Design an enzyme around this catalytic site. Structure first.
Site, mmCIF file in Angstrom:
data_model
loop_
_atom_site.group_PDB
_atom_site.id
_atom_site.type_symbol
_atom_site.label_atom_id
_atom_site.label_comp_id
_atom_site.label_asym_id
_atom_site.label_seq_id
_atom_site.Cartn_x
_atom_site.Cartn_y
_atom_site.Cartn_z
ATOM 1 N NE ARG A 1 0.588 12.253 -6.749
ATOM 2 C CZ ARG A 1 1.828 11.853 -6.439
ATOM 3 N NH1 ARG A 1 2.585 11.242 -7.343
ATOM 4 N NH2 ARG A 1 2.335 12.100 -5.225
ATOM 5 C CG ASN A 2 0.831 7.697 -9.378
ATOM 6 O OD1 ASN A 2 0.162 8.339 -10.225
ATOM 7 N ND2 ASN A 2 2.081 8.023 -9.035
HETATM 8 C C1 LIG Z 1 -7.038 13.658 -11.690
HETATM 9 N N1 LIG Z 1 -7.528 12.377 -12.238
HETATM 10 C C2 LIG Z 1 -7.418 12.388 -13.716
HETATM 11 C C3 LIG Z 1 -8.643 11.697 -14.345
HETATM 12 C C4 LIG Z 1 -8.184 11.105 -15.696
HETATM 13 O O1 LIG Z 1 -7.310 11.816 -16.475
HETATM 14 C C5 LIG Z 1 -5.986 11.611 -15.864
HETATM 15 C C6 LIG Z 1 -5.096 12.715 -16.450
HETATM 16 C C7 LIG Z 1 -6.063 11.757 -14.238
HETATM 17 O O2 LIG Z 1 -5.717 10.523 -13.454
HETATM 18 C C8 LIG Z 1 -4.731 10.786 -12.419
HETATM 19 N N2 LIG Z 1 -5.490 10.144 -16.285
HETATM 20 C C9 LIG Z 1 -4.203 9.766 -16.535
HETATM 21 C C10 LIG Z 1 -2.976 10.450 -16.531
HETATM 22 C C11 LIG Z 1 -1.778 9.800 -16.847
HETATM 23 C C12 LIG Z 1 -1.784 8.441 -17.164
HETATM 24 C C13 LIG Z 1 -2.990 7.737 -17.172
HETATM 25 C C14 LIG Z 1 -4.191 8.391 -16.860
HETATM 26 C C15 LIG Z 1 -5.511 7.946 -16.796
HETATM 27 C C16 LIG Z 1 -6.161 6.720 -16.998
HETATM 28 C C17 LIG Z 1 -7.549 6.536 -16.853
HETATM 29 C C18 LIG Z 1 -8.323 7.659 -16.488
HETATM 30 C C19 LIG Z 1 -9.683 7.931 -16.251
HETATM 31 C C20 LIG Z 1 -9.806 9.291 -15.909
HETATM 32 N N3 LIG Z 1 -8.562 9.834 -15.943
HETATM 33 C C21 LIG Z 1 -7.671 8.889 -16.289
HETATM 34 C C22 LIG Z 1 -6.276 9.048 -16.439
HETATM 35 C C23 LIG Z 1 -11.166 9.971 -15.574
HETATM 36 C C24 LIG Z 1 -12.331 8.953 -15.472
HETATM 37 C C25 LIG Z 1 -12.222 7.767 -16.465
HETATM 38 C C26 LIG Z 1 -10.895 6.979 -16.321
HETATM 39 C C27 LIG Z 1 -7.819 5.176 -17.138
HETATM 40 O O3 LIG Z 1 -8.903 4.591 -17.112
HETATM 41 N N4 LIG Z 1 -6.715 4.508 -17.447
HETATM 42 C C28 LIG Z 1 -5.544 5.401 -17.397
#
Ligand SMILES: CN[C@@H]1C[C@H]2O[C@@](C)([C@@H]1OC)n1c3ccccc3c3c4c(c5c6c(n2c5c31)CCCC6)C(=O)N=C4
Length: 304
Positions: A146-147
């Site tokens: 996830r990270n």
């Molecule tokens: C479950 N999965 C999620 C999809 C998404 O929402 C989440 C909350 C989740 O991830 C783990 N999330 C983050 C949560 C906490 C810190 C950073 C992010 C995050 C990032 C990005 C995300 C993208 C997408 N999530 C991005 C990101 C969805 C698709 C486009 C890119 C990205 O490009 N840089 C940082």
């Protein structure tokens, strides 16, 4: 003795970048896809803007600012690029857009198109990211699929520095070494353990470690000598490597630099090491409005 940390924290104007679509929300903060047109420079930079869950409890700011502290001090192709921060009210963290997102999701959402060359390449790249954090004496403490984020399906990067500490200094149970669960010892070697688990999440196409077993039980299972099962696609060579990351003698685990070597060897003959149904015939992807003439990726955007 420690070398002085001379990374640059870049402060950004809210006007230098426009938002464009929410990405994540709820759980904690609020992420946005956006573009960043620095100053007067005639470039545009796909970014993720992470403005934390509104209401601005002093505890939350000191928490994202550490992340940014860490992210600003890292520089490696396999560690998530921090571009700058913005001091608005609630504090915006601005990072490189990873258009494919969470790698754990990516594997879940694509099983049937993912082949051994990809899986082994991710393994190497994360091992490289981790080896680099090691070089800079950082212990991540939260490595998991996830990270890891996906910039393109051939290019992944370790993220989430909200738990990183320096080695020598001073809860995701299912990913933790045993010294960590029992005595909160965390070492670069406790990071190798979780590497083990990350790899297993990838080879099982994103299963959940010890599904069923609730967290209190885990230290006991591990102390008895139980580990995660060999995934279907894994040759004993690959699985042997997971297993060694799960040794009890921390110093008997392998080093990230060795993992790089081992997966890298395997990565030259993917099909000898991972047995996947319909492997030979598998292709994967490579981003909205039209003014994409001046877009440069953060990775090609460099600062003097
Ligand atoms: C479950 N999965 C999620 C999809 C998404 O929402 C989440 C909350 C989740 O991830 C783990 N999330 C983050 C949560 C906490 C810190 C950073 C992010 C995050 C990032 C990005 C995300 C993208 C997408 N999530 C991005 C990101 C969805 C698709 C486009 C890119 C990205 O490009 N840089 C940082």
């Amino acid at each position: 003795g420690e070398a002085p940390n001379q990374a640059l924290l870049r402060i950004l104007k809210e006007t230098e970048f426009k938002k464009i679509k929410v990405l994540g929300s709820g759980a904690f903060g609020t992420v946005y896809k956006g573009l960043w047109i620095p100053e007067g420079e005639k470039v545009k930079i796909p970014v993720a803007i992470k403005e934390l869950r509104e209401a601005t409890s002093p505890k939350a700011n000191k928490e994202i600012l550490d992340e940014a502290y860490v992210m600003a001090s890292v520089d490696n192709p396999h560690v998530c690029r921090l571009l700058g921060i913005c001091l608005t009210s609630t504090v915006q963290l601005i990072t490189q857009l990873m258009p494919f997102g969470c790698l754990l999701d990516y594997v879940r959402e694509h099983k049937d198109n993912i082949g051994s060359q990809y899986l082994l390449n991710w393994c190497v790249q994360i091992a490289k990211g981790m080896n680099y954090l090691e070089d800079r004496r950082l212990v991540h403490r939260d490595l998991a699929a996830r990270n890891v984020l996906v910039k393109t399906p051939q290019h992944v990067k370790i993220t989430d520095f909200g738990r990183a500490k320096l080695l020598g200094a001073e809860v995701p149970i299912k990913w933790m070494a045993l010294e960590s669960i029992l005595h909160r010892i965390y070492t670069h070697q406790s990071d190798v353990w979780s590497y083990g688990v990350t790899v297993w999440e990838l080879m099982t196409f994103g299963s959940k470690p010890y599904d069923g077993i609730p967290a209190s039980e885990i230290s006991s299972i591990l102390e008895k000598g139980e580990r995660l099962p060999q995934p279907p696609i894994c040759t004993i060579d690959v699985y042997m490597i997971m297993v060694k990351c799960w040794m009890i003698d921390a110093d008997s685990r392998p080093k990230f630099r060795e993992l790089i070597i081992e997966f890298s060897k395997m990565a030259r003959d993917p099909q000898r090491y991972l047995v996947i149904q319909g492997d030979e015939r598998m292709h994967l992807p490579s981003m909205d409005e039209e003014d994409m003439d001046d877009v440069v990726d953060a990775d090609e955007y460099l600062i003097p």
